[PDB]
Paper text:
Nuclear lamins are IF proteins that play an essential role in maintaining the nuclear envelope structure.
The asymmetric unit consists of four protomers (chains A–D), which are bundled by an anti-parallel pair of parallel helical dimers (chain A:B and C:D). A typical left-handed coiled-coil conformation was found in most of the coil 1a and the N-terminal four-fifths of coil 1b, in which hydrophobic residues were regularly found at the heptad positions a and d (highlighted in yellow). Linker L1 and an adjacent coil 1b segment (residues 70–84) showed the hendecad pattern, which induces the formation of an untwisted helical section. The untwisted helical section is bent asymmetrically near the junction between L12 and coil 2, leading to mismatched inter-helical hydrophobic interactions.
Author numbering:
A (entry chain B): 45 to 251
B (entry chain A): 46 to 247
C (entry chain D): 31 to 251
D (entry chain C): 27 to 282
Amino acid sequence: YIDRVRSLETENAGLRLRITESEEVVSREVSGIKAAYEAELGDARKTLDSVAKERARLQLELSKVREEFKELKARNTKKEGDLIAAQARLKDLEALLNSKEAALSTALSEKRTLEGELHDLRGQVAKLEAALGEAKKQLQDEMLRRVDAENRLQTMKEELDFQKNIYSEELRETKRRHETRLVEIDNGKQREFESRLADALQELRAQ
Amino acid sequence: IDRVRSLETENAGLRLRITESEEVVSREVSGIKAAYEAELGDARKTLDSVAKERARLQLELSKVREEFKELKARNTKKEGDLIAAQARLKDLEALLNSKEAALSTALSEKRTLEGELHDLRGQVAKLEAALGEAKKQLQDEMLRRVDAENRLQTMKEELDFQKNIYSEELRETKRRHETRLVEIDNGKQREFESRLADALQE
Amino acid sequence: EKEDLQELNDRLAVYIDRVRSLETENAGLRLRITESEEVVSREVSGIKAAYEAELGDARKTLDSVAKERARLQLELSKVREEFKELKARNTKKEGDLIAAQARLKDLEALLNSKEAALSTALSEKRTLEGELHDLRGQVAKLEAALGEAKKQLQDEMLRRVDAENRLQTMKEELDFQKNIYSEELRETKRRHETRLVEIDNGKQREFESRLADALQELRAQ
Amino acid sequence: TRLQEKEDLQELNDRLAVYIDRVRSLETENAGLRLRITESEEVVSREVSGIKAAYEAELGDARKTLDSVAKERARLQLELSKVREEFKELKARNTKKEGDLIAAQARLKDLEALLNSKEAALSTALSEKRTLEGELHDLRGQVAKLEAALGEAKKQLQDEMLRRVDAENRLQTMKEELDFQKNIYSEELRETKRRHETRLVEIDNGKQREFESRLADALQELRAQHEDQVEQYKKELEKTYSAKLDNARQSAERNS
């Protein structure tokens, strides 16, 4: 039963390496774990920092475009206010334009009627001048006729006075001449009566 | 048995001590994994965290970059509209000034029209008066003429009247003279016959 | 006495008869005178008849002309009255015409002013109408926007629930493979240890038996 | 009778004086009449020359009144013609004016109608203005609400997008973790099987060394024993050779 004891001794001689190798065994068991895990973690940190450096850039650009948006918003607000004011002023101006045009139209009509009245007055003046000239000529003609009629009246008067004086003087001369004839009648009477009485007696003594 | 049991106990204790002296090293390796995996597990979490944050920033960036373009378009058309509104505004102000000028000239022209109308009223009044006096004088001359003609007619009747009066007075005066002379002759012959018969009585 | 009174009475008788004779002779003389100044008037009768004839014609015409002076006087007053009535009617109608003309002037003025006010009102109404129409267009385009907004929202919700579903399934697969690998390693180590605790004796004693068989088979036989 | 006689004588003388005065006056009268009887031929002339002047002045005044009356009649003829002309002119003017008034009243009625029509259209438009202001106010409200709706919708879309992207990121993360744990299990299994195989070759090499050693010693002892057996066989054969040699010697050594 000594050969099995020798088997135990050989088992010990085999255990020698089983304890000896433990160092490099556990070292190699650790190196693979460290390698794989450190590779994974390293690549993780790589991608993480890449994403971070992207996020910084994104936030920067975002702040920039926000600033631009605020500027353009203020400018736009002022512009739209100015446009509203402009539209209000346009409304007021169009109202004033309509009112002014109304006043102008009324004035133009009220002036055109005056022009018409002026022209009518001008025609009236013309025809009054004509009618006045005609009346003047008629006045001259009738004046001439009146003057001539008075001339003929005066001539008639002169003729009448002439004939009157003629008849008067004729009557006067007739009466005067008859008186003288009476004078010679008495003279010739006394000288004539006996010159015929004796003429009758001388022949009366005969027969 | 003195070397047997010594070798048996030595081998049993040797293997049962060395195997379990490596077992604890293996468990320490397990702990090393228990830390490594933890750190990897938290880094793997922050990675998704910053990924989410970056997605958020990109979304907001696109949002602002769009609502900025919208405002660019709106403000552009508003600028155009404002240019047009100010242009037409100046046009209207000028037009209103012109209309006011036209109104002033129109009024201050119809005033002078009123003056000319007044002058022409004067002219028409004077002409009407003059024509009236002309017609009056015409009528006066007509009346005077027909008066002269009537008086001419009456004188023409008198001219033939005094003629007949003359003839009548001449007839009467000659008849009276003849009566005187005839009476004288009759007296003559009366004394003639008287003395003739007287002497006839011897 | 006796003689004187008889003488004087004879004188008185003589004087009386003298008065009588003188008055008679004077009456005779006056008779001749009044005969003369009558036989004369009958001789001047002719000029008297002529004069009276001419006067007769004179007033015969005078009455006619004086009748004309009446007729045309009446006619004159008649036409004067008619002219007065026409003057009144003319003054009234001309006053009414002047009034109508003034009313036409003021009326045209009010017309122009009124049309100005109406034109301004219509312009402002047209501006309000334009604003209203543009607002309606705005509402239309905002509806056309909300539609596509909700469509995109639902699509994105679907894609979201898809992504989260795939995430959950990925967690399932992860725990699955982790448990599998753990149990696989555990079973491998178990079979390792069982094989070793079997080879602990099962091959030791039998192999040393075969070795003794070879040694004894070779050393002697 | 004495004084009576004296008084009668005196009265007689008085009567005598009366009749004497009368005969004087009567003789004067007779002389005057006889004087007139001669101048009859001339007082007649004065008579007729007087009545002539009377009638002549009468005719003169008559002709004067005739002339004046004719003048005053012609004057009224002229006045009558004048007024009858002015009436004509006035009635012409009034005819024209009474036409113009009709036209004026016509255009007056028309223009007043037009003015009332305008004053109606103005109130119409002014009411439309208010009923439009209310409308556009309501539309402003509608747009104001719809803008808020669209804003909220866009916000929710942004959020859904964000959480979806986050889900996909975590998905890729877990995929990488999956592959990692795979490549870890591989190396772990490899490292365990390596140890187990080193122990197995430890056992098998022990078996081998023992086997070839304990067999090599036995085979070497066997071959050594064979060589010894052959050596002893050869030495015994050499003993037989020398024995046969000496026996042949003694056989040839045969003699007396």
